[PDB]
Amino acid sequence: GEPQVQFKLVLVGDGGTGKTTFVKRHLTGEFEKKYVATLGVEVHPLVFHTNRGPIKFNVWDTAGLEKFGGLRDGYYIQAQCAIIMFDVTSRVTYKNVPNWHRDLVRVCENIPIVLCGNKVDIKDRKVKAKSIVFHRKKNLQYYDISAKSNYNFEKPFLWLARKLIGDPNLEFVAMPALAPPEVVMDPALAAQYEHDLEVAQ
Numbered sequence: 035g036e037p038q039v040q041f042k043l044v045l046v047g048d049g050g051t052g053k054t055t056f057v058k059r060h061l062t063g064e065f066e067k068k069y070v071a072t073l074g075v076e077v078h079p080l081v082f083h084t085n086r087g088p089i090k091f092n093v094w095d096t097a098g099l100e101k102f103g104g105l106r107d108g109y110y111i112q113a114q115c116a117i118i119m120f121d122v123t124s125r126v127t128y129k130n131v132p133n134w135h136r137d138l139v140r141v142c143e144n145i146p147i148v149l150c151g152n153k154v155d156i157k158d159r160k161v162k163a164k165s166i167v168f169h170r171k172k173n174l175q176y177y178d179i180s181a182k183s184n185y186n187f188e189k190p191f192l193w194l195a196r197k198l199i200g201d202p203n204l205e206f207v208a209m210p211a212l213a214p215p216e217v218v219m220d221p222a223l224a225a226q227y228e229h230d231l232e233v234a235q
């Protein structure tokens with residue numbers, strides 16, 4: 035009878051930015067993933083547990099290394115939300131963000147979108163906070179991320195659940211089982227970066 039609250043999420047951005055690494059941190063979603071042969075995609079079911087009940091994000095991760103413009107319409111059709119990703123050690127991935135946005139909005143129009151800057155465990159960072167107080171001003175929320183250490187993993191999913199359910203006080207009551215950190219996210223470096231965003235804001 036009474037079914038599941040489920041949302042289609044489309045994960046997009048340049049080849050090599052860490053999209054498959056980020057979505058694979060949720061272990062039960064990787065083990066139960068579904069290979070949809072004909073659209074070139076892997077659909078991952080990520081269940082999150084809130085104070086108002088359980089929610090599911092059906093994350094569509096492309097299986098190729100496609101280029102801006104080269105994602106069929108079927109990949110985006112009926113999407114309810116999205117995450118756009120770039121790598122902070124490569125400037126060309128961040129310059130392509132606007133074209134990935136243009137592709138989404140043409141097919142889906144006004145849907146809640148989060149912007150993510152990955153690989154902030156690396157010391158030699160090229161794209162900093164002062165240049166990210168830019169683009170995000172499309173009604174787009176920004177978060178610094180590190181996929182291999184699990185740094186800020188829940189933040190993009192918590193922001194999208196608040197918009198789609200309609201409650202700004204919604205919280206997660208327990209965290210999903212996650213793959214153990216494989217790199218070190220220095221604790222004083224993370225604090226320096228957070229201070230930099232507030233300065234930039």
Ligand SMILES: Nc1nc2c(ncn2[C@@H]2O[C@H](COP(=O)(O)OP(=O)(O)O)[C@@H](O)[C@H]2O)c(=O)[nH]1
Nearest residue numbers: 048049050051052053054055153180181182217
């Ligand atoms: N150190 C580090 N490397 C990362 C991180 N995220 C991705 N990478 C590396 O980037 C390469 C490409 O990642 P992949 O997930 O295949 O990217 P995709 O093309 O967007 O699917 C891999 O060798 C990853 O291990 C991160 O958080 N930290």
Ligand SMILES: [Mg+2]
Nearest residue numbers: 053054096097
């Ligand atoms: Mg991939």
